Every structure is written in C-alpha cells, then in structure tokens.
Design a protein around this nucleic acid. Structure first.
Ligand SMILES: [Zn+2]
Lengths: 204, 240, 121, 369, 286, 54, 126
RNA sequence: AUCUGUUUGGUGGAACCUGAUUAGAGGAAACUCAAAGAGUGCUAUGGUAUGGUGACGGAGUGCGCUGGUCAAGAGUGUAAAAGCUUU
RNA sequence: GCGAUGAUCACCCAUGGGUGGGUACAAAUGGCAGUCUGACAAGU
RNA sequence: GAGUCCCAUAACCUUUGUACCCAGUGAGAAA
C-alpha cells in the first residue's frame, strides 16, 4: 500500500525511487518489472480509488498497532506479572479464554499448561491416548527458546510459574504494578531453561 | 454438489482423478477462487496453517483434450514444466486446463484469430499469468514469430481444412526436435464428402509428409462423433 | 467489417430460408434468441441464423461468441421479417437454430446449407 | 551463398554473419538436420556481428507491428545500413537471409543491392538461432528474452484487439465485492463502538441509530457538553442534551481508545460512498443501459453474481437471477435486462438510449397491471 | 527437397537433349532471380525454350512454359548452350549453331555429311565446341573461325564428352569399347589417360567441378568414379533397382553425383561414400 | 500420515468397494489399492446454478 | 481406394485386365488405386524382366502413397496401414497376404480371378 | 446371557499344487570407497589460426578494386522516335 | 388498438388477518462439554 | 512422563430475534 501511494504508475516508478519502503534489494526487481510487464495502464479515476484503498489499509494497520499498544497498557496495568512472564497478548488470550482473571487464577497450573488445546485434550482422554503438552502457552517466547522435548518440559515449568504470578496478580491487594513477582519467576524459568539446554543426550 | 472426493494423481503428470461414486478428471487451479466456464471445483485443505488449494473438473464433452485423456492416450506431451502452443484457442475453455496442467513454471501461447474470444482470452490470462494470448491468424506464423520462441508441444484445435499446413508451419517455426504434436481432427469440418477414416488417413499421411511421425491415434467416440486425436512427435530427421 | 459480418447474399438467403421453413414444419427449428442460446449451450444445434437488421444488433451478436466457442456455423440473413415468415410464426424472429436430428427427413438439405455457410464463414 | 542473417526478436534486431554454408543438396539428411540442434556445430555456421536493442516497450510494440505486417521500420533501416556492405544493384547483390517472404520486398524497396532469401535453408538457419537464442548473443543484451516476450505478446494482443481499460468490468466486480466486505466491516466496527459507549450512556444508540451519525457525534462529545448548537448534524439533539443532563451510565485511556475506534469507523464510512460514487460512475461508463434499466448498484451486483459483463451477456434470458403479476414482472425485467446487457457488452462505446427505451417498456408493462 | 518445381509435356518423341540457359535477349531483360530457363531438343524436329518459376529469392511479389520454339527440318540429337552470348548448338542430322533471338540457325558447322550424336561446349575458353559423330568420330569446332577445327576417328563410337572445368583444353570421352579416354585438345594423337574398369559400353561421363575426378556411368547397370591421374575406378556404385545408367552428372558441390537410369529414376549419390555432410568441429575435422 | 489415514480409512474402503454400494451402478473392473499420495477434497458447487446438484 | 501389390499387377497383365477399368467394372464404382513406395520398390527390384509391369504401374491414373519405414516389405506395410485405418480395399493375390487381410475384420479384398477382378469382403457389390 | 454362530477385520500359515529364485533373505547409516548407465548444463566457436622470423612494420605514391552519376559506343525497335538491353 | 425483441404454465374466513415447515444474518453464563500426570531428574 | 501451532481464536445442534418462500417451458393471449 505504501509503495503504490508513493509511485502510482510504472513510468512514475521509472522516474522515482524509494528507500523507506522495500529495503535496498527489491528495488532492481521492481524496476525491471516496471520496465517489462504484462500489465496494462490504469486511468486517474480508478487510480484514485486504488490510492484511497491503499491509505485505508495503511491507516488500518496504524489502528492495529495502536490497539496493540492499548492491549499492552491495560494488560500491564491489570495482570502485570503475567506480562513479565509470558507476555502481553499471550496472557491476554489466556484471560480471555478462561473468562475472568480470578477464574483463571483459581485454576491449577496443569490447566494453564493445556489451556488452549481442549479438543485434542478431551479426544485424547475419551480415547486412551496421549494428551497434548502445549496448549495456548506454546507461543510464549521461552517455549520458543526451547527446542525438543524440553519445550514440553518448560511449558510445564512456565505454566507453574505463570499460575504463581497470575494468582498473585488476581489475589493481591498490596500489589504495585511493577513486575517483581513475574520478574523473579521469569528468572527462575530462564535459568531452568539454561540448565536443561546445557545438557546434551550425546556422549562426548 | 457438496460431497467429498479423494484426489489421486493420474498416470499423466499434472492431472488428477477425483474418486467418489463417479470419478472426475481434475486439474489443479492456477487462479483459485473462481470458475472460468462454470465447471465445478474441489477444494482441498492441504497442510503456518494449512492452505485451501482447489481443483477444477475437466469436462470431456467440452474439451477434446480431456476426451482424449479419459479415452486413454499413451503419451500426452503437455507436461508440468513445458511450453505448449495452443492453436485455435477458441475461448478460454481448454486453454485454462492446459495452462494449469502446464503449471506456473511453464508457458501456454494461446493463438486465436477472432476478437471477442481474444478479449475473453486476455481477461483470463490476467488471472492465469502463464498464458500468452496471441491474437493472430495461425495460417501466417511469421506475423507472430517475434512473440513466441521454441515451444515443446503444439496442440491444434483448429477446425479448418488447411489444418495440416497450419500445423506444419507452426511446427517448423516454433517446435523443437522430438517435441509433441497433438492434433484434434474433426472429419466433418475437414470435408464431408468422404468418410471419417479416409480423412483421418489423409491427415496422418499429410503429417508424415510434413515429417511429423504419428505415434498414436484415438477416436474419442463417446464424447464426439467422428473426431480424432492424433499424437505425433516432430522427428525432423528420419521418420524411418 | 461490420458487427453482423458473415451476411449471405440473395441466393444463399433463399436457400437458408427454404430449409428453415422445412425444419419448422418438421419440428427441428428452435426460434428466437434465448431459445437459440439455450439449444446452443445444450449442443443440439446444427447452424444458427441471425437477422442483421433488428433494432439493436448486439441483442443477437451475443450468439456468434457462443457459436465460435462450440464450433457451430452462424449466418446473417438480412431480413427479420422474412426470417419470421419462413419460421412460420406470425411475428418477426431475430434468431433461429436448426436442432440436430438423425431421424430427420431433410438432413441432406441441412448439410448442404451448412457446407455453403461454412465456406462463406 | 546466404551471407548475412537477420533475426528479429523482442529485445531488438540482430544481424548475424554466416561463416560456413550448410549443405543445399544434403539439407534433408539426418546429420544436417541435427547439426542445428547441436550447439557445438551451429556456432561453426553462425556468428553475431550486430545487435541493436530497442528503446523500450513502445518501440518494441512499434517494431512488432511493423515486422508483423511486413514493413521495414526505421531501426531496421539503421541496422541494415550499418551492417550490410554497399554491394551492386545489378551484379552480385549482398544476400540477406530473412524468415518472411513478404518482408523481403520491403527490404529491397529500401536497399536495392540486397536480395533476400527465405527458403528452407534460411528457415532452418533462423530456427537454429531461435533454438539457441541467449547463447549466441554472448551476453550483450539487457533484459531476459522470455520476459520481454511475455510483455511484447501481451502488448501486441491488447493492441490488436483494442483492449480498453475504461470498459473493464473487473473494476466493478472488485468494487462491489469490496463494498460488501466493508458493509459488514463498518457494521461490526460501529456495533463494537456502540457497545463500548453503551456504558457512557445507553441512549445515543436509541436516539441516533445510524452508525456513521452516532460515530461522528461521539467523536466530539466525550463529556457533558449545554451549547447544543453544532450537534444537529434539532429535536434529537435537544433530547440528547437532555439525556446528557440525565446521564445514567459510567475513563481516560479507554475513552481515548474508543475515540480512535470511532475515528476508524468514520474513515471507513467516508471511504464507503466514495467507493459507491466511483462504482456508479464506472457503471455508467461500463454498463449504461443496465444502470438506466435497474440502477447502478443493482446492475453491479448482477454482473458480479454473473461473474462478468460477458457472462451476463451470453447467459440466456430465462436464466437471469434479478433481485402472479409480481411474479412475471420479474421475468419481463429479466429478459429486458438480459437484452440490455447484451447491447451494453457488445457495443463498443455504448449510449444510454436503449436502456431508456427498455426502461420505458418495463414501466409501460408494470403500469398496465 | 527432392521434388519437382514443374513438369512439362515437352515433346512427342524422345527428348534427346536438354540444357539450361541465361537467355541474353536484347529486347527483354532476363529475370534470373525468379525464372530459370531450360531448353530442349527432340526428334520431332523441335528445340523449345522454357521458363520456370523458382522460389530461391523472396524479392518479388507468371507465364512459365514455352517462351519460344525453334524449328529444324530434320531431327536433333544433342544440345548444349554456350556459357555466354545467347548461343547454343544442336547436333542431329547436322550440327547447327543458334541464338535465342533468331528463329533459324546462324551457321551450319558440319565436317561432312555424317550425322552428329553428341555435343559439349567448353566451360572456359567458352567458344570451343566438341561433338561425337556416329562414324566413330570426335570433332572439335571453334567459334572464332566459325568452323570445325580437327577431328579424329577412333575404333568405336564416342557416346559422350565432358571438358575439364579446371584445365580448359583437356576433355574426356566416354565410348563404346568399355573405357574412357582423357584427351588433350592440342594433341589428339594420344590419349593422356584411359579409364578402363567398365565392362559394357560407357554411356556418360562428367567431371568434378574441382577437375580432379570423373564419374562415368555405363551400360552395365553401374556407375564408376575415377581419379583423373590413375586410370582405374576409385569407386563403383550399383543397385538392383538401377538399370542401364544413361546419364550421369557431378553436382556443382563436387560432393554428390546425379545418375539417371532407364527404369525412370534419378538418384543422388555421395561422391565420397564414407563422407557425411554435416559441419564438423575442429576435433573431428582434424 | 497414518494419523490421517486412520481418519479417512473408512471412505477409502467405500471407494475400494464402490461396486457393491448401489445394485444398479456396475463400475468397470479395476482394483484400486490405496494410493501413496492422495488428498480428501470437497466439491464446491458454485453460486451460479441452483437446485439441481445442490 | 484400393492398395495394389506386385502379384496383383503381374496377374493383371497376365490376364489382360486394365487396372482402373478392371476395378471400375468389378466394384461398379469409381476407384482410386494406390501404389505404395514399397510395392514400387518391389516392382523395381523384380528386374528387367518386369519392365512392362513397372511402366504400367507408372501411370498417372494410379495415385501413389509414401510409406515411411525401412525395408521394402510390402505385405507388412499393407497390413499395417490397413489395420490402422480400415478405409482401404486390398487388391492382392498372395496366399499369405490374402489370409492376413481376410483375417483382419472389415477389410475388403480384391483379387484377379479368371478374366476379371473379384471382390469378397465388400458387402455392397450389386 | 455357564445364548448363539455366521459375517467383517486383525493374528497365524499345516498338506497338496503353481510360479520364481538360490555361495538363504534382508535392514540401517555416509563430508565412506570404488564400478558403470542415462539425462542436463557451459561459447562448446582455427574451413585451413596474430598485422609483422629488419626476410619486418608504419607513412606516402602508383597500379588494382567497389558504388552511383553523366557522356560516348553498340544492339534491338521505329516514319522518326521514345523505350529497353550492353562482361 | 398483443406476442419469439417471448404468450403461457401449507391449514382457516364474509385487497386484510390467524397457525406453522426452510432460507440467511446475529445472539446465548443454551447444549455437546468433561480442563493432563504427580516425585524424581541431571552431574561427579 | 505426555498428539495442540492442523482453526475451543473452532465446528455442529438447539433456542431467540430480523427479511423472504411453502425455475424451466416454448405459441399462445384477448373476445
Ligand atoms: Zn511401404
């Protein structure tokens, strides 16, 4: 959208350049495709609607990132230790999954582990199969840092510390919105992730 | 109409069979989300989430090449990386199916002479980028010798009595050696005073006189009365 | 080149109109523009006659594209009034179609007219 | 003797110099016929002496049309006058191998000292250089030859058919298919705006039910106010100021956020009805008869559901889905509308007069009942 | 393409000679880039000159056959055209010289009242004719003096002559005792070669355009190629389908040999059998 | 995978034993073992014609 | 259209039947006789005893096909090009070729018998 | 159900018979070592190899060569022509 | 003062209502529908 | 120890509100 707002037309692209969009290596490709192309030439009365749509979706993404700013702000003002541990939008869809923050706080840590994967969980319980291990908590950055079966392992330890921090946030009264319990819990999860990424199943 | 089929690859590369209780000749869709001449489609969900890719039913009563495929041809030369020169691209009916059999890495040059079919060809070649529409008479290949270079198969769905001369001229210009020559011969449009076997024998003799060795012919009888597909290869030296 | 291009001259026009009248007697003629396009997309049609002087012309120029798609001969008679009079109905028609039949007593005449208008086209 | 060779191609013109003649008498033999497939022996026949590239796709299309209809263009004149030696016109002309027997006369009309050959020897020399292409040219052209071929084929075809992008119905297909999308987007977004402002006072969605009017008035009211003069765009405005006096529902950051949300709804609301005006204009220039008969938005949805103006045209009249006496006016309007769409598609630059006549006919038919 | 430009029912009897011309008319201009010209004599006392539409240049865009009809009182037996100046010569009951403008012979150049069976013009020193008469005689004519020059009588009958295109005074005769004779025009008292390997009467001879070898078809149904300095056959070509090879030419490529047999067929052969006609990379050429 | 073959493993049996589903259908004699690569797909009847295949 | 072979031509000349006139009064229809290049090769290979037969096969009324294979086996060529197409009458007198042709179905067979041509597997001769 | 005993699906594979194969039949690994086959890519380019062993090169002159123009000749044509041809 | 440029073709009362079967859209703290295990593991 | 990234961010059913229904044909129609 930003590039068609910038140039508009192919001969206009032949006379203009751009570096704030499309970084430094697709320029020769768009210029060669501007020189030779199977595309027609548009008029101004529909280039105007093309430009209106392009500025429309540019402003749409501006609204998207500022709504994400609002979500980050309300989340770190409502349950900030969960933000310090698992992150803003992950904790947000945890809370939005379980309904209330207190209804998520009074659930055990195993539930917070498997919280997104209910259909896989209950089919793997109603026939005697193996249950999932990730759920909605798979998209946390720590589980992203883990690799192998120990992302199941630190999904478990991350759900345990997230239950700790989450019910602290929901049940505290002298809470300070400063991330202290979430930060010490995150340090615990990070050095645990370190000590099980340091081991290796090879023999040296 | 809302049923479920299983897609299975055919012997021919690039085309598929959808088995249900009636099985369908099927191709992948190069422009997903719309039908070109009102055929039905099949949408599979192949596994970032899985993506809905889709498939188009090839109708043998509206395509001589599909009638040939599902009558049983030992070798089509239309293949998933090739270049096909479609002669007599009368609309985008069979050219769309040849286009998405040939795939995104191959090229279909769709030659047509009339102009309202050419307008529909250009509007179809927008959403199928691997189609080069050429609005020109195929009886003069020099008038578009600049736009096409070194095709791998020619398909001829022209319905003119100077068919073999058109096929020979376009092959000698743009076909490569041991490339494919697929012909759809319509007996009644060549000439109706003789019978169908006489005109097929004469057309095959004309092809080998213009040094295209015929490998195979098929009558394609339940879909078209008195038609034929002759599959040959451009031998260029030594039909013997 | 006009829009209604492959027009017939007077001898071919009267040959066409005579076989149109005989097919209309033998129930082998579907007359009118949307009946003609119905039988054309159904595939039961041997050749279509459009009249090149109705009050719009694109109203039946939609049919040459269909005939080209399905490889059916099409020919332009220069009188909608004479075409309707040959069709045997009390109104002018602008398009008519000869449906295919093999238990047809005029098959040789229809094939001769098809050959004449196809060498024209 | 076939001394020089002229190969035309989308990137420009090439003059080759024939080094070794191929056999004339043994030209149908197996080894002579496959030496043009082997590249290691074709380079013993043909050597590139010149390549004049084109100035762009405009001169490419000009020279493609001139080569197509068999005329010598100015770039041809330049490269042939640079490359071919000044031979005699009466004794031993210089021999140029072309591929076009009716381009030959245009070459001798300009250079009388050049006799042109396009028989089977020149034909298979030409198809040898076509078969090898980019390898003969030794790296001296800009642009991939097949990419220029795609561009030149599309340009040649649209020129030959007179493809106009004004009467391009894909614009109105995508315009109405996007307009339905933003209908439901403005609907759901202003529904959430009304939901988030429902606990500031839940009567603005009772007095002012239209989504745009609600959103634009709540974009500037954020409080009580009193001063109810510029809130009439005043009985509803007076009732609204009375309700603001009798406020009966419950921030700052959340209220700033729902102000940004209502500004988004207002931006969608005036990009819609810009798009609607655009597609009424595009429908008047693309389908004037249909829009005279049943209206611009209805004709837009008609050709969208049909898929194209061509598909709606070539459809039968008894199979048109338009949207007793009430049951058969639909059939009358259907076959008149099919007639109007045929007129409108196959006329090249249409008028409005037949849409007018068919509108008069269908109003006469409905007024008869 | 191995296919006829045109056919012509030229005469009623045997067409006993034919050659090709660039006819120097002095009223018209010869269009040799689109018309070819062949003229041909038969035993029905006619010499006819024909033009052929030829697709070799694409310069132009046409009244092909029988542009004129020369007429003699007796039959003709051989014909050959001068390589300039609109002239040809026809042998028969007597040898006449003609040009393409006049409808009658310019000069009768006959030694005695004994008929002439064959004729060849020289290729360089183009004004020297040679002819074979059925009294076992070989006569040379000169066209400066417009007269015969010298004749020899051999044992048996000379069927054909061909001049050496690279040596201009040497010719080869092909005669009925089964061998060919390489003769010097300046001394006809001795042949300077005899090419011996045929087993029946030698019907036709021709030179390579390189002047280095000759081809020689005979009445035993076989043709033979001879190096010019040796005197025995370098090669023999035969076929169960080929009968009584009456005409042999050596194509101007010096690489193919055209033979006309008497079952009807004209066949191409390679002069070097093991030699292929593709272009060669330097490794295979070396 | 076998995890998906254990979900479509029944209608592949139906397609293998097509010939005894309707007493009037009578297919041509093939064997049709399960192909190595397949895909299960749903027919889109479009929004053009109604009521016939719908 | 009728494919001739060499013993049919030899028996025609031995029985003094013209080719196109014998075909016409056998079938009571207009015939186009065809000499394939392998039948012509076989007549030429027959030698100088068969000069009369060769230059009666050289006749402008007898059209001629162009076979594209190696070797001159006319029985193989006639059998292949007739079982490919079924639009041909085969005129022959070889016992083996007669058995091959009358074993493949739908192919009429003509042969010199007596002093005129006979035709067998053509069911509309009168 | 200490009813039933058929069907479908899995496990198992005696006897006979048929077919193939046989220093029994395999399997896994690879920046491993060899033996071969097919296809594809790469200017893959001396039709007789640099501009030149002071025997040489460069400059200039003379001869040679190319093209169009004009003039003359000659043919052909004709009342005169014109035109056309001209190694 | 017609027409092929198209004629024609679910239950109850003395234009209007009563009763429901399918269509889409939206909603639901309506349903399916029930939130895994539990004490060892890694190293020297 | 342990099947989610393969739509529990979902699918289907039920109920509740909003807008409708209960194509082909091919020469008749009117008096
Ligand atoms: Zn043969």
């Amino acid at each position: 959208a930003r590039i068609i707002l910038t140039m508009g037309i192919r001969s206009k692209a032949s006379e203009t350049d751009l570096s704030e969009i499309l970084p430094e290596e697709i320029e020769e490709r768009v210029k060669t495709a501007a020189e030779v192309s199977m595309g027609t030439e548009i008029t101004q009365t529909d280039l105007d609607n093309i430009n209106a749509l392009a500025e429309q979706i540019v402003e749409f993404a501006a609204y998207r990132e500022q709504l994400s700013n609002y979500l980050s702000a309300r989340m770190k003002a409502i349950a900030p230790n969960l933000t310090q541990l698992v992150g803003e939008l992950v904790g947000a869809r945890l809370i939005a999954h379980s309904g209330s923050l207190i209804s998520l706080a009074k659930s055990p840590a195993s539930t917070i582990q498997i919280l997104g994967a209910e259909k896989a969980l209950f089919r793997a319980l109603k026939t005697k199969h193996d249950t999932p291990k990730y759920g909605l908590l798979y998209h946390a950055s720590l589980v992203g840092q883990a690799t192998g079966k120990n992302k199941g392992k630190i999904a478990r330890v991350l759900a345990a510390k997230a239950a700790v921090s989450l019910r602290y946030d929901a049940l505290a009264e002298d809470r300070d919105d400063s991330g202290d319990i979430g930060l010490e819990s995150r340090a615990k999860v990070e050095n645990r992730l370190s000590q099980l990424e340091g081991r290796d199943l090879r023999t040296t | 109409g809302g049923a479920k089929v299983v897609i299975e690859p055919h012997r021919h590369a690039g085309v598929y069979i959808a088995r249900g209780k009636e099985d369908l000749l099927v191709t992948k869709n190069m422009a997903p989300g719309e039908s070109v001449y009102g055929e039905k489609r099949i949408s599979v969900e192949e596994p970032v989430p899985p993506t809905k890719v889709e498939y188009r039913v090839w109708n043998p009563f509206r395509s001589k090449l599909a009638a040939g495929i599902m009558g049983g041809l030992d070798e089509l030369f239309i293949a998933p990386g090739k270049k096909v020169l479609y002669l007599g691209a009368a609309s985008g009916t069979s050219v769309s199916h040849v286009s998405d059999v040939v795939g995104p890495e191959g090229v279909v040059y769709a030659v047509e002479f009339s102009h309202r079919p050419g307008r529909e060809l250009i509007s179809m070649a927008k959403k199928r980028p691997n189609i080069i529409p050429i609005i020109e008479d195929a009886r003069h290949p020099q008038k578009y010798r600049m736009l096409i270079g070194m095709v791998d198969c020619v398909f001829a769905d022209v319905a003119q009595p100077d068919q073999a001369r058109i096929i020979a001229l376009n092959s000698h210009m743009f076909l490569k050696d041991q490339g494919g020559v697929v012909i759809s011969i319509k007996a009644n449009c060549i000439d109706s005073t003789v019978d169908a076997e006489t005109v097929f024998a004469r057309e095959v003799q004309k092809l080998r006189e213009e040094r295209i060795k015929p490998l195979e012919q098929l009558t394609l009888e339940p879909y078209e009365r008195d038609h034929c597909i002759v599959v040959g290869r451009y031998m260029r030296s030594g039909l013997k | 080149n006009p829009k209604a291009f492959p027009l017939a001259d007077a001898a071919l026009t009267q040959q066409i109109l005579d076989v149109v009248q005989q097919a209309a007697n033998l129930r082998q003629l579907k007359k009118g523009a949307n009946e003609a396009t119905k039988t054309l997309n159904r595939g039961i049609s041997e050749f279509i006659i459009m009249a090149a002087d109705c009050e719009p012309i694109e109203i039946l120029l939609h049919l040459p594209l269909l005939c080209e798609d399905k490889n059916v001969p099409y020919v332009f008679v220069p009188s909608r009034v004479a075409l309707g009079r040959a069709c045997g109905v009390s109104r002018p028609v602008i398009a008519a179609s000869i449906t295919t039949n093999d238990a047809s007593a005029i098959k040789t005449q229809i094939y001769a007219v098809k050959d004449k208008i196809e060498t024209l086209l | 003797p076939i001394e020089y060779l002229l190969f035309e191609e989308p990137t420009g013109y090439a003059v080759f110099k024939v080094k070794l003649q191929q056999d004339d008498i043994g030209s149908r033999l197996k080894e002579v016929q496959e030496q043009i497939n082997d590249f290691g022996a074709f380079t013993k026949l043909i050597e590139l002496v010149s390549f004049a590239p084109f100035k762009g796709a405009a001169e490419a299309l000009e020279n493609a049309n001139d080569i197509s209809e068999g005329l010598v263009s100015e770039s041809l004149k330049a490269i042939l006058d640079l490359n071919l030696p000044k031979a005699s016109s009466k004794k031993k002309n210089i021999t140029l191998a072309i591929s076009d027997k009716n381009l030959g006369p245009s070459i001798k009309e300009e250079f009388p000292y050049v006799d042109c050959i396009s028989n089977e020897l020149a034909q298979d020399l030409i198809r040898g250089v076509r078969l090898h292409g980019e390898k003969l040219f030794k790296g001296l052209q800009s642009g991939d030859l097949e990419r220029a071929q795609l561009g030149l084929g599309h340009a040649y075809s649209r020129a030959k058919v007179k493809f106009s992008v004004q009467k391009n119905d894909n614009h109105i297909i995508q315009a109405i298919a996007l307009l339905d999308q933003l209908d439901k987007d403005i609907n759901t977004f202003a529904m959430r705006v009304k939901e988030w402002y429902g606990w500031h006072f839940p009567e603005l969605a009772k007095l002012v039910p239209d989504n745009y009017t609600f959103a634009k008035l709540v974009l500037f009211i954020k409080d009580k106010a009193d001063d109810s003069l510029h809130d009439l765009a005043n009985e509803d405005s007076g009732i609204a100021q009375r309700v603001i006096d009798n406020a009966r529902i419950s921030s700052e950051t959340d209220m700033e956020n729902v102000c940004v949300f209502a500004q988004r709804v207002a931006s969608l609301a005036d990009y819609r009805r810009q798009l609607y005006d655009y597609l009424c204009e595009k429908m008047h220039t693309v389908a004037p008869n249909l829009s005279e008969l049943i209206g611009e938005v209805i004709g837009a949805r008609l050709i969208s559901h049909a898929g194209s103006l061509t598909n709606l045209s070539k459809q039968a009249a008894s199979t048109v889905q338009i949207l007793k006496n009430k049951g058969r006016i639909s059939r009358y309007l259907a076959n008149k509308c099919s007639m109007a769409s045929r007129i409108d598609n196959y006329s090249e630059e249409p008028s409005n007069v037949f849409g007018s006549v068919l509108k008069k006919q269908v109003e006469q038919r409905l007024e008869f009942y | 393409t191995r296919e006829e430009f045109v056919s012509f029912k030229a005469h009623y009897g045997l067409v006993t000679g034919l050659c090709v011309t660039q006819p120097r008319f002095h009223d018209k201009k010869p269009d040799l880039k689109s018309q070819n010209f062949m003229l041909s004599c038969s035993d029905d006392k006619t010499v006819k000159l024909w033009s052929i539409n030829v697709d070799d240049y694409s310069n132009k865009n046409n009244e092909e056959g029988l542009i004129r009809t020369f007429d003699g009182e007796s039959a003709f037996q051989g014909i050959d055209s001068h390589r300039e100046n609109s002239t040809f010569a026809t042998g028969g009951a007597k040898i006449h010289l003609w040009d393409v403008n006049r409808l009658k012979p310019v000069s009768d150049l006959s030694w005695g009242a004994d008929n002439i069976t064959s004729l060849k013009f020289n290729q360089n020193e183009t004004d020297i004719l040679a002819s074979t008469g059925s009294d076992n005689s070989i006569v040379l004519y000169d066209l400066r003096t417009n007269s015969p020059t010298q004749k020899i009588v051999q044992t048996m009958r000379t069927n054909a002559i061909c001049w050496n295109p690279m040596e201009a005074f040497n010719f080869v005769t092909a005669n009925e005792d089964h061998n060919a004779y390489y003769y010097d025009m300046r001394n006809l008292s001795r042949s300077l070669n005899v090419f011996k390997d045929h087993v029946s009467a030698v019907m036709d001879v021709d030179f390579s355009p390189t002047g280095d070898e000759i081809v020689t078809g005979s009445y035993d149904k076989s043709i033979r190629i001879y190096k010019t300095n040796h005197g025995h056959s370098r090669e023999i070509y035969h076929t169960k389908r080929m009968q009584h090879v009456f005409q042999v030419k050596y194509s101007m490529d010096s690489k193919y040999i055209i033979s006309g047999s008497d079952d009807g067929n004209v066949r191409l052969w390679r002069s070097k059998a093991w030699e292929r006609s593709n272009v060669k990379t330097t490794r295979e050429k070396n | 995978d076998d995890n998906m073959r254990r979900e479509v493993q029944r209608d592949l049996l139906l397609i293998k034993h097509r010939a005894a589903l309707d007493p009037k259908r009578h297919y041509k004699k093939q064997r049709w073992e399960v192909p190595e690569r397949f895909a299960i797909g749903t027919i889109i009847e479009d929004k053009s014609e109604f009521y016939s295949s719908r | 259209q009728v494919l001739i072979d060499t013993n049919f031509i030899n028996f025609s000349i031995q029985k003094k039947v013209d080719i196109v006139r014998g075909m016409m009064d056998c079938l009571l229809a207009k015939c186009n006789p065809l000499i394939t290049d392998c039948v012509m090769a076989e007549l030429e290979k027959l030698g100088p005893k068969y000069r009369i037969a060769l230059k009666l096969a050289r006749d402008p009324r007898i059209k001629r096909l162009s076979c594209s294979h190696k070797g001159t086996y006319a029985d193989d060529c006639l059998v292949h090009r007739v079982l490919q197409h079924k639009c041909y009458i085969v005129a022959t007198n070889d016992a083996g070729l007669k058995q091959r042709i009358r074993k493949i179905p739908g192919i009429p067979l003509m042969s010199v018998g007596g002093h005129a041509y006979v035709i067998e597997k053509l069911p509309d001769v009168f």
